[PDB]
């Protein structure tokens, strides 16, 4: 049942993308797009709530401790700005 | 017998002045840097 929630509540089409490349034409796939899609938001949610809440970034260390372990692993970051930011570049 | 009594006390006031701004100042730099230590969290995980 958690499995079935999580689902209903997530695959829903207008977060879903059909994507294809190689030697195809569009027009096929937009049309086994409708044949075999079609039919998933006849539904659409009233009062769901599937919105994303942003993630506080926190300076911290988390140090793990282990001599029997042959090397360090060392992982070290700042905050970064998100997919969105032109910034990336 | 003491002609510098007047000064030393000016100097004096200033000394507690200064001291009483400096002391909280100094003493709020050296929490924050050991505010890592204070607040740190341990945990023991053996297998």
Same mark, same amino acid.
């Not at chain 1, 049942?1 to 829903?12: C, F, G, I, P, V």
């Not at chain 1, 049309?31 to 044949?35: H, M």
């Not at chain 1, 988390?62 to 282990?66: S, V």
């Not at chain 2, 003493?27 to 230590?37: D, E, N, P, T």
């Given at each position: 049942?958690?499995?079935? &929630? *999580?689902?209903?509540?997530? *695959?829903?089409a207008p977060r879903m993308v059909l994507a294809a490349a190689g030697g195809l034409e569009h027009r096929q796939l937009l049309?086994?797009?409708?044949?075999h899609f079609s039919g998933l938001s006849g539904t659409y949610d009233e009062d769901? #709530?599937?919105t994303l809440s942003p993630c506080r970034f926190t300076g911290s260390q988390?140090?793990?401790? &282990?001599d029997g372990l042959p090397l360090a692993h060392v992982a070290i970051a700042v905050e970064g700005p998100g997919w969105a930011?032109?910034?990336? #570049? | 017998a003491e002609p510098e009594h007047d %000064?030393? !006390?000016?100097?004096?006031?200033k000394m507690l002045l200064m001291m009483g701004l400096l002391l909280p100042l100094v003493?709020?730099? !050296?929490? %924050? !840097?050991?505010?890592?230590?204070k607040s740190r969290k341990l945990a023991y995980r053996p297998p």
């Open positions: 049942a958690d499995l079935t &929630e *999580y689902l209903s509540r997530h *695959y829903k049309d086994l797009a409708q044949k769901a #709530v599937p988390i140090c793990h401790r &282990e930011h032109p910034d990336n #570049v | %000064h030393r !006390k000016r100097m004096g006031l003493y709020a730099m !050296k929490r %924050h !840097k050991w505010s890592v230590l």
